[PDB]
């Protein structure tokens, strides 16, 4: 059985393309695959295919990393093919060649084929039980054509497979391998619950806080290099609870020597007061000299009770989502997570004994964007109180026209500084702040710098991820109902706020907002989150 390998050469409309296919072919088995594997010089992931010409059984390999590969493998796959003949005939390097045609997924192939060596293959799994196809077109333009074919010792491709082990897959899974192997994972946190029960309580891996409305892991965070991005995943459903809760996946900065985690640890009164005139006290709201305010990676909202409700709530016409999907960019906080243990957690307020499962992970990917090119991350307050049932007042501090007021220290320029900014308003009746639009005002070193209104008027959209949603008598559901910056089953999207450059020394920024007035036991309450973002430029000494 003699062996043949074969080069091929790409064309587009005349125009020689590269990195060129190899068909190695046998009566027994045929290999295809291209130059840089055969060399060891391809890229992970990367594809063989391997035929066995006894049984037809077609084999797909993937070469995952040094150590994995992967494999599916068919044999119903030639026989599926379907082919028109021609009476068109020629030849190619010397070889006696007929053509045929195949439509796939409406382009149309014409494939060249020799029977001529009693050896089949070619450029691509078509036309590999016809004989050995020397040339392809695909829509008259892209040609794929044999440049040589010559007689080899043998089929070896005992140093292609060397080191690696091999698992063969489903279809689904053998792509969704490849897929994965792409970018990289963080694993955080998987069917988890969210619920309150005073028996909730931490273990080795998973601490509990907020009498379980607060689960907190310690995760390894790679070095990721300024161009790469990353984004936060969240999948969340009820197990119980009715509501459309407040929720945050968030990290905790330990940069200074107290934070959000001796809050959490050893109880709201670790943390530092804040205070600005109204009579009240709030606690670890701002940046002090000794204290940095957790960071929200994503805040976000629960739907009325999915998943949990679906089968007991029937509404004609309504079918329900399973679940409720969150996922945010979050690159410009790379500075923060890059090669750090971080501290990360997520939250849901609740008062529910089955409360809500989540799911939790990053994903870094090894992109070279020149987009978002802060290398400077500071946060300066936030007013969430994720520790709501843990002591932690509500953010009721906008009565005031202080609001929030921060000062701190940049110990370099910083071009092209940011405030990313999240807001949501709260107060849960039609005159509550939740309910009705107020302006926010953003001021840098006493000066007004941006003023919005924040408002989501989408808010009917998501209405099958909202069976517990109430129904009121105008004919709308809760969850239609325009709102302060926020819908049920949705991410409140940051807004990032130029601030211009800014000078090192001291700074000052300002939240006013005209918080609304109590009803009863009612209040209206701002939950509002700030980050400075920007570039410090380097110092460095002149060469080429
Ligand atoms: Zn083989
Ligand atoms: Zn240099």
């Not at 501290?343 to 990053?362: M, P, R, T, V």
Request: with cysteine; charged share 20%.
């Amino acid at each position: 059985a003699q062996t043949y390998e074969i080069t091929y050469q790409n064309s587009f409309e005349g125009k020689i393309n590269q990195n060129h296919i190899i068909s190695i072919t046998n009566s027994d088995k045929t290999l295809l695959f291209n130059e840089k594997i055969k060399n060891k010089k391809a890229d992970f992931p990367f594809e063989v295919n391997e035929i066995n010409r006894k049984n037809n059984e077609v084999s797909q390999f993937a070469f995952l990393n040094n150590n994995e590969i992967v494999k599916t493998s068919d044999n119903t796959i030639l026989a599926k093919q379907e082919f028109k003949p021609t009476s068109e005939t020629g030849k190619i390097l010397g070889y006696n060649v007929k053509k045929a045609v195949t439509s796939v997924n409406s382009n149309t192939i014409e494939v060249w084929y020799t029977n001529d060596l009693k050896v089949k293959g070619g450029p691509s799994i078509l036309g590999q039980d016809l004989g050995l196809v020397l040339k392809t077109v695909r829509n008259g333009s892209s040609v794929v054509e044999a440049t040589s074919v010559k007689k080899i010792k043998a089929l070896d491709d005992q140093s292609l497979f060397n080191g690696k082990n091999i698992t063969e897959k489903d279809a689904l899974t053998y792509k969704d391998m490849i897929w994965k192997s792409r970018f990289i994972t963080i694993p955080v946190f998987e069917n988890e619950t969210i619920n309150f029960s005073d028996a909730s309580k931490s273990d080795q891996v998973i601490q509990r806080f907020g009498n379980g409305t607060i689960i907190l892991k310690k995760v390894k965070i790679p070095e990721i290099k300024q161009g790469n991005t990353i984004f936060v995943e969240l999948k969340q459903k009820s197990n119980g609870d009715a509501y459309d809760r407040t929720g945050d996946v968030f990290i905790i900065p330990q940069e200074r020597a107290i934070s959000y985690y001796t809050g959490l640890t050893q109880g709201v009164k670790s943390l530092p007061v804040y205070q600005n005139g109204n009579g009240k006290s709030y606690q670890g709201v701002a940046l002090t000299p000794d204290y940095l305010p957790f960071i929200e990676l994503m805040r976000f909202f629960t739907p009325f009770g999915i998943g949990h409700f679906n089968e007991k709530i029937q509404l004609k016409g309504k079918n329900w989502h399973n679940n409720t999907p969150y996922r945010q960019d979050i690159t410009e906080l790379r500075p923060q997570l890059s090669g750090k243990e971080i501290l990360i957690g997520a939250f849901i307020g609740n008062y529910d004994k089955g409360g809500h499962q989540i799911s939790l992970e990053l994903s870094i990917h090894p992109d070279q964007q020149k987009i978002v090119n802060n290398n400077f991350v500071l946060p300066v307050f936030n007013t969430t109180n994720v520790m709501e049932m843990a002591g932690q007042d509500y953010p009721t501090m906008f009565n005031s026209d202080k609001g929030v007021e921060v000062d701190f220290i940049l110990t370099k320029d910083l071009k092209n500084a940011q405030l990313r900014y999240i807001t949501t308003g709260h107060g849960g009746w039609g005159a509550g702040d939740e309910f009705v639009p107020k302006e926010n005002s953003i001021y840098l070193d006493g000066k007004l710098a941006h003023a919005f209104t924040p408002w989501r008027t989408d808010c009917g959209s998501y209405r099958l991820f909202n069976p517990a949603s109430g129904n009121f008598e105008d004919g709308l559901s809760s969850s239609d109902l325009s709102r302060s910056n926020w819908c049920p089953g949705t991410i409140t999207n940051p807004v990032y706020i130029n601030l211009g450059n800014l000078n090192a020394g001291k700074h000052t920024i300002q939240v006013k907002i005209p918080q609304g007035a109590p009803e009863g036991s009612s209040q209206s309450f701002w939950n509002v989150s700030g980050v400075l973002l920007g570039q410090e430029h380097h110092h460095h000494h002149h060469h080429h």
